[PDB]
């Protein structure tokens, strides 16, 4: 009586970043699902590495499955492939299979020295000026915020 | 010749040109068609493409397909449909390409349920099938009778039925490695009806012992690595009188029973690095067998792990006549 | 001694006309209080790079002044998320240089048959010797379509003919074509169904890197006249490591690019006028490309071949049409590689494993 | 064009990548002495992938019992351009159908 | 002093299993002491020597003192001669003399035309281009030159002046050999089968000898013991007439048999 369809992803894996050698795991949620596995960097991840949790959500009628996989610093630093350490999620149903987002695990860092500091200018009352800023190298890309006299400025204001 | 696509002599180069469909202007003299690394969807296939009889090899890898394509060149022999999203295989599609001999379907999302009942049997001339790196849970039923090589490795196959390898007498190479396969998964003598089989491989699986009732009539190469093989029964390697290459390295073996390799007369190479070999009295026959062995046979990997007194030592040579064992 | 933190270029200079000589070099972290950065990046004080000496010797040695940018352009990253530095210990010695081995023999005048080892079980395959390491080791890889995944090592020439191997390497990926080469104890090969070059250290038996050759045609798209997934061909000469391939931008014509054996990056690209499928094979000598045009089994109303008909210089960026007779006893030419240490060609021609002798011009300009 | 403007501190501002598309932009300084050309900047405008409208459901392959129905969703509205990001999610849709006999 | 010509090499003692796959260990034959000098081999990082008071302390892992060497060591050719350490300096064809008592470098000798830094090492490599030996005749240097076409070149070195007091060229290739040792001025070349060489099955025996006094060579067949496969270093001690062999991760001692077949 229940409707039968391909697996639909709820919690797709999001890009992870390793900080101070603390291994951060990847989340995966799909419905309807009976088997959920990870395909990291082209090849399947071993069954033992997977931790399944067949928790039935109230909001949805069909069977929900949640699988978590730990990714260590040693795994990323010893991987010498062409692209960034990526992972994908494959879910099994009675009709077929479905792939998720490619979540890329990277080594998080940030530099002290700014690439280009803003330069001071003398401008008339009607004149226009642009203040340039190049943030330091780091993964992920740095979020630039402007401050007028050590207090933030609102662009929409 | 097309405008967007640049043809060169007896070849057509429509590769890496951001194309979503096959170009119209295709000559009737072309033999090889390149359409790989594009964005060609399963909907962008004209009927006129089927009419180009001269084409024998088509390359469509790294595209954005959902199903096996329709209206492909009639008299095609070799097809390259890999690194894309194929999930459905229809009987009508394979019925068009009768002359198809070599088929590669690597890295696709092919599932057991997605393939139509006896869809591969429609390609009567098929000999090479590559269902590698797909989303397979078991070996499909309706396989071609005159198939020579079935490469169904690197999936999620846990169970194999006896009827999966029916009428596949003509098969020579079977590669089922990198799967969730156990001894409970393999049916009572499923592989027995494959007389012409020469090479067999179940590496990186979960076998507690080698699969019983294996064909010996033509088998030359047998590979059983990274499995959890605790012990090998005596009957398992008998009636394989044609075997030359055997590998059992990266397994959970401690000791072997005397005369387990007595029927492997044609054996040229045996590999047994990384194994927890417990060297006691059960290895006395191993050392003696290694001494009277001919130059024809190379046996490597036999190294002790227990006890601490003989730890790391090679089973090739004994000291003080294996202590007080005989 | 000289020291410089990450992304900071280093400078080396000897007094007068004296030459720089590297003694010890390391790119990583041994001490945490020398450089000044974030304390999180300084937590790991055990980063090492052995290849540091090899890089410095190729650039600073046998020169008066030296400037090497301590970054990813010249040095590969050993430990990620760690602020590295370059520690170099150098001595000033006379301006003398070592001859013959590094030096160019000249312009190719004629190719002749030299040695015939044996007749292999495979029609196509590739064999070579490491020109950097002073050893009589022979590396053998007989090409089997959709099945090539092993590299065989032989102790000597006598063992290679007799078929007595030392060790066999189990590669992490399938190899495409007969283009492989060995550079300083590391194997460089084209990975199947990809425009990528894989670096595999034979000593450690692990993959060290994978480089993407931009716009390169792969997997029977633009191979040599015999096909067999020969799309990407690797070469070794006096100038260094090279990549012979083809792009659709050059309309199937041969594109030659110099590759760094440590950073695995393109250090220059050159486009030729010769079509790769029309070519039988190619080899590099002094940064000069030599295109082989040979005759094959099954050639309808054909006799034209067994010649070097095209040459391309990288330094001058100019091409010329030559006519150097090439030996082709058996028809199926599979692989042609040049070894700068012995100045001989490593050929595989229709099951036959052969070595070819070379003759050179009095000048090269 | 209102989309492009020159600033007093020598800057070229583009609001929308539609009214001023890709190209090899080069900055040039002029003086009473002479003129000087800068290194050209490669500004490339990319179009991100967007899914196209759903198709119709196919007929049930099996005459009696459990059947199949398909619906395709291609990445052509808009189709990725100049190295734009590919479409996110699944391309095919399948539902179980029961045909009365 | 000479016991005679070597007949057979046999297993004697097994001390322990070290954490490193390669290295060397030896005792000073001149000084009448039970002191053991330990050397773990680490690529591009070898710079310390460990001294042990006795055999019991060496097995138990109880060290007396550790010496901080002035330069990085290349290969497993470590040798001790009358309270002074003789080692090969990294990326150079230079023996370095270091007095253990004063803890200072006393000299540095250049071994002429010698191949160095993985150019001509043993079968397993590991920068074993230059190997030092101690016997009844004195201090010796086992190496290879390009003049001899990679073949083994043996030279007697003075432990005081640090100069070559004679040079001999052999017919055996250094890379084809596993290790070598000197007894009564006679060189013994060991040929063995290593790990990850799963193709190999051949017997591990001594197949070459070279006399310095007679300047004549012969092809022998003395069986060499190999419980493990990674034979790192083989050194002879004239005081106890035993071999200081390092095989794989393990550290062993080998007993020696002698014959009176000498002029
Ligand atoms: C591995 O993942 C599980 C959750 O699936 C977590 O509880 C466990 O702590 C992780 N392992 C480590 C070492 O953190
Ligand atoms: C398959 O083999 C069975 C016997 O096991 C035989 O009865 C059947 O006819 C064969 N199928 C075909 C198409 O010949
Ligand atoms: C350059 O310097 C290196 C460093 O030792 C040396 O080996 C080489 O012989 C010198 N000469 C040339 C031409 O490279
Ligand atoms: C800049 O782009 C133009 C085409 O718009 C091209 O012709 C020119 O060669 C390019 N210049 C560079 C340096 O890429
Ligand atoms: Ca070549
Ligand atoms: Ca020695
Ligand atoms: Na090659
Ligand atoms: Na020594």
Numbering used by the authors:
A (entry chain A): 46 to 202
B (entry chain B): 36 to 361
C (entry chain C): 100 to 464
D (entry chain E): 203 to 303
E (entry chain D): 202 to 464
What wording appears in the published article?
Here we focus on three structurally distinct cell surface receptors: the fibronectin-leucine-rich transmembrane (FLRT) proteins, the Latrophilins (ADGRL, Lphn, Lec) and the uncoordinated-5 (Unc5 and Unc-5) receptors. Most protein–protein interactions shown for FLRT involve the LRR domain, which promotes cell adhesion via interaction with itself (homophilic)2 or with Latrophilin7, and triggers cell repulsion by binding Unc5 receptors. We find that while FLRT2–Latrophilin3 and FLRT2–Unc5D complexes consist of 1:1 dimers, complexes of FLRT2, Unc5D and Latrophilin3 ectodomains form large assemblies containing two copies of Latrophilin3 for each copy of FLRT2 and Unc5D. Taken together, our data reveal unexpected structural versatility for the interaction between three different types of cell surface receptors: the homophilic adhesion molecule FLRT; the repulsive guidance receptor Unc5; and the adhesion GPCR Latrophilin.
